[model samples]
Target chain A: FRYMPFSPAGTPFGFTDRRYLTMNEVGYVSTVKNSEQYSITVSFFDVGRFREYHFEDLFGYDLCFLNEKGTLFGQSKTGQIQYRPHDSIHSNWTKIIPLQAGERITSVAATPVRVIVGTSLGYFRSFNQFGVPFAVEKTSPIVALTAQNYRVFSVHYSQFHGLSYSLSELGTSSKRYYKRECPLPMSLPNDANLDYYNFNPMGIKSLFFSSYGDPCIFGSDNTLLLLSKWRSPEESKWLPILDSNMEIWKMSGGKETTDIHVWPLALAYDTLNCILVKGKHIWPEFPLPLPSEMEI
Target chain B: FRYMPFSPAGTPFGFTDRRYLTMNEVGYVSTVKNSEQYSITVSFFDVGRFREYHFEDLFGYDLCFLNEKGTLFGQSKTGQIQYRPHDSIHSNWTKIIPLQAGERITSVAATPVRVIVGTSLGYFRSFNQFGVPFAVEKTSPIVALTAQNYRVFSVHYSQFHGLSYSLSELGTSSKRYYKRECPLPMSLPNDANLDYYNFNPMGIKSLFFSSYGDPCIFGSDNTLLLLSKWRSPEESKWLPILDSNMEIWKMSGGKETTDIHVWPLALAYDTLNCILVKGKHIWPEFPLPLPSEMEIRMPVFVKSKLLEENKEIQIPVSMAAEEEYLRSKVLSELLTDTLENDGEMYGNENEVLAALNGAYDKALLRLFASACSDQNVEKALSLAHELKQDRALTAAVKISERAELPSLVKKINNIREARYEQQLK
Candidate 1:
């Protein structure tokens, strides 16, 4: 098992002792419809890194979209209405429909629709065809957001006690809940005093359902944790017990620095392996394996 | 008398400092030959700054002279050359001179003097002219030397010492000095810290003293400094302590970083306040002044006084005020306001050609803007005559002028017509 330390302000998350799952390569390999020989694979590396503003690095996921090659193929951050930066910093990302803030975008299967973005100030913003983020959906305190099928899925972290609703019922409009008392279990302590409490107080950052029918949470803390089942403790229930075998591998840059000790900020990843396994280093660094225990 | 704490690695130099003494206007005030009512003072905030190999900032003394109105009247360096920068960071500098290592510039004082530059290896070198520091001079090192005007004066540890030899009066043939204890005072010390030598210890690297009194010296560290008087302890005697000042003040585009705080390298100076500073700015924080001191300066020539003095000025070049310069190169790249909006093009074939010629001519004018000389200006005059016909091509070319395209075109056209009239008269 790989032993990794968390930054003091990291999000908290822990995984089961030993777990294995198959990765569904989006555009390659065998799908329900057909078995296709894959030429490339683009997987998100949810290493749970909280990059503050994100523009400090040349390659980032702001208004720009990175290709499988880690090259920025499209962007519209400058509000220039046109595909700018054409002369400088050649980009591979093309300008699509601009997006505003707070528009809940849901992608069921293959739809690539533009949606409102989640904001820190509890409001909604929109984007134009150029990908310029604009304020369209007026809302209060957006809590979570993600990009899928070229659309956005957002949740508002509000003052209400554990939102009581289903992920299927959360409205595309108005403040709603994906679930009441969150179906996912907190990876660490429920109290506010622990490191996991600060990192993933409610384990709300990144939660993906596991093949074992349990939700998996990747917290700001350097941990790939499994969520407790809604019912019992010894019955694979309760908070994620720190599983040493699960790891989170960043798939961008290759060379890891001594001070940070973590692997380089990897951009693209190969979904064929687990979190901390052999994967393509799409950004700039060499290919690296995940830590032993920190795998997912 | 400024109470400034000099950075450990650098000395303090300011705009108001005597380094820019020629533009000070203090000396011209006392001269009775000029009009007493005229107040002439010039300040060059946009000094010439060049980037080095390591992407560090190195300071060099550049020659940019000004008219009474403080406009760039002329500029020249040790080598009779000019620059036209291709990038935003180096808009003030140009891409004219390609300085290969070991190219020796014999003398910048003459219109086409000799310059000796060193390549990566000490064994080979070349001498060349100002515009081309790589073409003229030979690749071989200066070997069999005699005592004439070409004698070498060496500098060690900020100290000035000369290597001299007595020649036979009859033949003026090759001869060594009287005592021959190493004609120059700079002898390598025993067990000294040779680790920090700017150039080869045996070969003459960091220094050169011309027949004239001007001295140029580069340090092992990147402190390229030149002093009027080699032995003076007072720092003011050094002309333009520019090693690091250029990094802070003369930087290019607003966003990029400079290397002055990193690596320090070479320095060269000329008589008329022109400095050619180069080296690696390796350290991101500190920069060293360059060129160990030497004593060899020949009087350079400039002839820019050919145009008769007139009260009517051209475009912004005549307007040397800070506000005017700010108006030249626009600050906001995106927004086009009333004051900043570029005007519509008339697409007049003649006017358009005049406008393009005017812009390029303006750049050439800046290159030779010295108040004392006008050779480069004369060269520009010839080029303007050649390109003053096409007005169909519409393009903006003001280095910076708050005035929109229409007004700038009008101003430049006015100047062009006036020049034609003057030439006829």
Candidate 2:
């Protein structure tokens, strides 16, 4: 594949030195570099792709953007939250209620309706679209948060890590927040040294769910949760792909939108690797171009 | 590291089957699997996490989604695109345009602003959020499409062996793309058949760029684009990680989002190997928790280091492996010199050589080492040239060097060069 970079030229270097590299949308990449007096340069694509700000970028401080509308949402390390419609100036932002001291902001998700902030110490808080207090709840430590179907999903810490959701009708106050265990049977190896050779079989590194209610769980070492109904420990297993023998540092995929079904499958292998796999124990080995496809 | 997996229950197995593995947000992984029927059953977290989908999933078809308020998106093998705002039934979806026949709808994407469909044979089409055709332009074949910041980026082919397709402005529609000569120098080995040995050094497996605009290129061979930007063939090179030899099939890393600069160092090795490295020619060997962290620094290619390190070669633990114990005993004394012997050629060696009656590869290796130790230059050099496959010849040279066989060293060097050219031819 022709390497169509975000910019045509003159921008590959100096990136190795940037302070922050992040993406809010698929196929959308952003780098945030902040300096001494909170000077920040937010670069998108080159030429028409870059903007400079005079405040803290998402790096040491915290920041986020809503998916399509692309409004800016950020939290300070001191637990202060801020919002901006577009990139006018770094100072051009609106401030929201600051969170508690002990509740560390581990994840932040912004939708057109509200902004959701998850914390390391088990605090889940949301603000109305206008930065008004929407909902707040306490649950198991919120490991990560993602928004889907106008609702947000939070991953919690457990033996196999649990996922919590509170889906209900327009009865906002009655929205019951609950956590579900994404468990697996314990399979231990004989040799202690080789214990990790198979890697984190149950470590849920990537979590995504569709309208189907069941969430897709993937581990950092390419181990996946093969959900085959029954609770028999031996029944539900961690399915590792064949011929794959490397630590996959990252995995990101959206549910396949179809007239038929929506599946959360990811594609990667920067070693110039590419493939399309879903949650089934057996997945399709589809065809693509020469170079790997850009993760959309 | 304890290697405590998600369960700490099941032992690691069945990993060789992974097809699509990547992290979207930090520390969250996903997989896509479908059945023979159009229906896809996406099972999530083991127990309470799973609710099967009877709907058709994206496979050999077009699929797109918006962020935060994610509505379902999908297209058919034929040229039909559909979207479902919420889940009710498998049939619940709104169709956009079917487009033309066999332009080959290879890619499709959705933004809150519009919908995009790319064809196999160069065509980029877009519609307003309400499904009104906004822009239709002919470009190179759309290999893939992704949306970010309310805009859809189309990956296209370059007429001049390049990447084409322009960007759509939020203000209006003015597609402008970029082209530059991004080529890495080909520094292959003298061995011809090992062309793919180092894997694809320039084969970009993953391409991502941010507001900076320059694309970060990662190769399938754990190679990287070290962008110093002098344009010299040697200056801009693929700096593979140190002590990294296995074919690393995949690497995905988010830029470090910190108050500090973001770096694209990656960590992996599903054999539970992990490390953080970037584009710098020099890298840090950071400390990590592990039972095998020491395995990374242990030398494997150099037998001289292994034998000279005063370490004993591990004999096979098979109870029926009695023959190997004899040779291991004889070679152990011959090399290490723990016993205070005059280092003289022993006639009793014939007994051990006699015992090595079988055509054994290890025996052949042991025989070469013993000959060099005995100052038998003729037999040593003969095996030096004879044992031409992997490391035996190198072992021959190392032993001959320690034995002070000056005459043999020159010949061994010549033989090594000759082998390189032989494979090249």
Candidate 3:
């Protein structure tokens, strides 16, 4: 029974979306779906009693920002920025972005004072700490938001290029007041341009801005670019952060037709500054425990 | 003579270009000419006596960044970010930009940590604490640089639009170490296209990143835009700070007259959580004044001869009547000038001003005025042609207006006469 602590086992479940995977101070959170229901697994690292919670409605596309205190939960879909409590699914999930007729939340970031969310229809909406929606403006789809020292930097992408802007006074009373009167959006210098040095119009596969506003762009061609915040041609230095020769694979199976994909299944970052990219490896098609073994 | 501090009086210096008058923390610094000699007078705000220093080569277009301690003084000219001790002028000014043979320094900003400079050749050169230089390449002209809490932000302009970028850690030991091997410059998210917000091609006039790194962009159109640093567009908000009717001005003229010109003259943060813009004016004609003057004349320009005669007018006249007179005079002059020069000022006034005023230094003014003529205005169509070594004086004379000559001549002669008078002394 002591093995129960670490070696928890379960029946094979159906496919799951990548957005359901999340990491927090407590442990890792993952979700799996069965034919009849969806289950969430909360696995604590050391004290292992992998707890599972069941729910039904399909989850959003990506894990949203968790409030600093860990009491508030948030997520992004193609339509809206949602907020809820961390305790139970029965609690209310607040739609922070006032739902328009035709739009989906594409990105979200949390600051100490506000929840910022981007939409597929090219708009940004911000909600104050009091849960009141204050400002909204039209813009390109927001790809990501990075925070260092309570300040939030947003990455907004166009057809080919994108830029980052600083959120002013987002956590303080002044920002709250400013949010009430007029929403003021500020931008970094031209350094936010993805095409400033590299010309991968296909778009950056992944972009990460460090806490200090330093950015790293993972290009589709497997080129990893480390960009300084200065908008100078010589200032933009690029090195291939990834190897093009790295093999990628896709997998699927069962009575149903399989599926294939190239994109990484998951991505994560840690305090150590290590980027974790997780993908699936294809395995040979086979079934476990043959009929001969069943004779025993 | 005790009135010297408050009633510091000198004859109206004839037609001095805008550089001689600058404001700083201590007080107003102005230049006036007597005969052939030019003298700089520093008027302290509290201590009324104005002190004058002699030795003239004329300052650059505008004041560059002044360190918080007020020790280092930096300014930018065509190709150099020049530095000298705050206490004195120098025969040889130190150049912050090591300056390639063909490139010129175009913009500069300094924090306590380093001096960041941009070049006409589309490059950025950062100087460390010890004055060592590192260079980076840029696609557009580095028009302005802003420093806050030791971080440098660069505003670069292309033909249609412009954007801002932050200079990587330039002050730290690590940055200094990395700077020696090869220079690194960071860029904005998507090459500075705010088209995501339905705005295009307008340059960012001023840029400030909050203590938390949230950026507020003072757009060329007087739009105060705030952008969340978060990469998500839905998360980034663009707000117009000022209405369209908001007026902005230009100072320290340049050739190739650009449409994109609102630049952060200076930036500061207050305990009150307010970002203060303390440089240049927003008037259509003249560059804006320092931020210190915003309360007296803000959101709009006022009419006053004090401002007209000496752009460095900062002292608040306590006399209600004097204040009213100056206000009306400046307003009237602004209205009259705007009306008189409206059509003729459109196409290339900026270029003409840059070209003409560029040659207004002491020696050049003398040479140009001595060789003066009216028809010469259209003679040289190119900046190179007019500014060529031997022909600069001839070119300057050609661009002169008949009305401007009396003032120009008197001003040039005043220095010469002053020199002659000083020699006699």
Candidate 4:
């Protein structure tokens, strides 16, 4: 047989249908869909250390516009985004765009005519139809940036030690800058010090924001309930939504307690109608992209 | 020479009411209400590989029971269930009960009594109370578990070569395990050979499930979302939540092309309220004991600094038979030292700085390696070299000028560079 001899017939036993695609990899994941054309899948692969995980820095912000045949149509990496068509003999990966500090595309929010990216530091930049950077802002590491008309409202927050009411602002509009200590600092609570190690803000594994323009929620450090006023009309400081456990965390990773192989790494928020996809568990690989199809 | 050197006549700095206490290595945090006292702080320490971030191994778990004057409690190392007042020094911590798993001294309705734990290997074990041997199920890594009244439901999935789908159970009752998986093993639809080195189910850093009764939605690899009927009373399989970013997330963390962050970590489900708490930038710590004031939705929740600290979270955790066999001696020493110490506030400059540096060192190498592999080492050496050269780490450290390990740095760089080149093939 091709790979496994246990195959009962010519076809790979369980591998028959689309490859059993389980997304178990490090980084923030978002599904890109368009009503008109085939949906595109893009993922950002850049996670620093936290507790029990790390990611390689070989690839910069990566973009893979997969085509049918379960292959990539055009692949690109920001700050040296590279790509190779699905069938190219050579690994046609090459830098597609140059990047600067916090310039690596953190995430993509596509509007009718443009795409907004949440830069690593804390800023939102707008990309025109040509896929070129033009606008920029120095803000928090953007958890998400939504665009409407020519105006765009972005939501984001400091990974750890920083909490505030959910914040939302126009991508094109300028704003004031403020300096303050982070709500949750890098170090774990004194008594809980031994419980945290290698925890990084960048390793934020998942995000779930409330609908109806409310504060965006995120899951990091398996037990944290991070609250941000991404678009909330209120002016409260980013609140750490405490659980019944009355505990708070500022990073995201798989649960590491001994007795339970707990996989609560994924975090999210739910509304009456919509469910927000927030945090996730640390898997060893990325989920298999869906077979090329439009669910609509 | 006077009590107030700067403003002896008018209360120097005019801050007599600022309420700042002078603490010298010894201090604790506590809270008291209505003459009734409850120490609510806890800590956790683990023997997993050095998060490569700190030499925290020697410290272990600790908690502050009652501000600066309380005693440290002792318990087990396995389950969340623990006994408090277990022989505290100065009679501060005293034992009230023999440690046992599943025994609950207190609980909030949503707070569970049992949980399913997944293992590094593809197996899962169940722990009851705070001190009990785990009951193993089919030899599969328990990826997910939900606990309710008397039982816990677990989800188990084995490994695959490329992208893989997962299986989960329903309800908290483990007695009747309901298993469901993708109609087909969900592999990367586009024939992408998952770079196992960089891609593992464990590498999938974050996930979010819909509130308990709403739905089960999972997002991973930065672009895929799984909407399933895992939690619904109706039978269903995993389905898609959205067509693409053009709808939602595009405005939150989305970029022109990708995100600096991709995975979702941390999750909390409010069974009563049916609201889900999710975010990107937080890691899991020892969950606070259930029955906390927050459960009742009070006007204010206690802060980590101000919450009554207790080391009970660590004590009641019963170590698995294997872990006890591996690092029992060392963990015991660390735990003992922790029990003997009383300063609940940690602010030593040297210790803090060391911890920070350790974080950077591990960011490049050790975080990835395990008991039987050098793949992560090769990856780490290269990443470390690059990190040292990266303008960011340098700016963060601001100490590049003083270091002189050119040979070692070059060797590391070459190894990583070589690996990078090989990955392209």
Ranking by lDDT: 2, 3, 4, 1
Give each candidate's fraction of reference contacts reproduced. Answer: 0.00, 0.00, 0.10, 0.00
* Per-prediction backbone clash count: 134, 70, 96, 186
Comparing 3 and 4 on lDDT, the stronger one: 3
Report how far off residue A11 is in candidate 2 (Å): 19
CAPRI grade, predicted model 1: incorrect
Query: What does candidate 4's lDDT look like per residue over B1-425, in tens digits?
Result: 00000000000112111110110011211211212323332222221411111111121111111112222221223212222222243322122222234321111101123333333233344443342434554444333333333433333344432222344432344445333333211222121223321222332222333222222222232222332233331222232222222212323323233322221211222111111113321111122112111111100111221122321012111112112211222222222333344222234523533343343334322221220032222222323433422433333222212233344345544555666797799
What DockQ class does candidate 4 belong to? incorrect
What lDDT score goes with residue B374 in model 2?
Answer: 61
Q: On a 0 to 1 TM-score scale, where does candidate 2 land against the true structure?
A: 0.27
- Candidate 3: where are CA atoms >4 Å away? A1-116, A119-155, A158-296, B1-63, B68-84, B88-102, B109-117, B120-143, B146-425
TM-score, chain B only, every model? 0.21, 0.37, 0.40, 0.31
Tens-place lDDT digits, model 2, residues B323-388: 232223223322223122323233343454333333223545565666567665554555454342
Candidate with the greatest DockQ versus the true structure: 3
Off by over 4 Å in 1: A1-116, A124-140, A147-216, A220-242, A245-296, B1-425
DockQ for all models, in order? 0.00, 0.01, 0.04, 0.01
Which of 3 and 4 is the better model by DockQ?
Answer: 3
Among all windows of 10 consecutive residues in model 1 chain A, the one with the lowest summed lDDT is A25-34
Of 2 and 4, the candidate ahead on TM-score is 2
RMSD of each: 28.3, 33.1, 27.2, 28.2
lDDT, candidate 1, at A88: 31
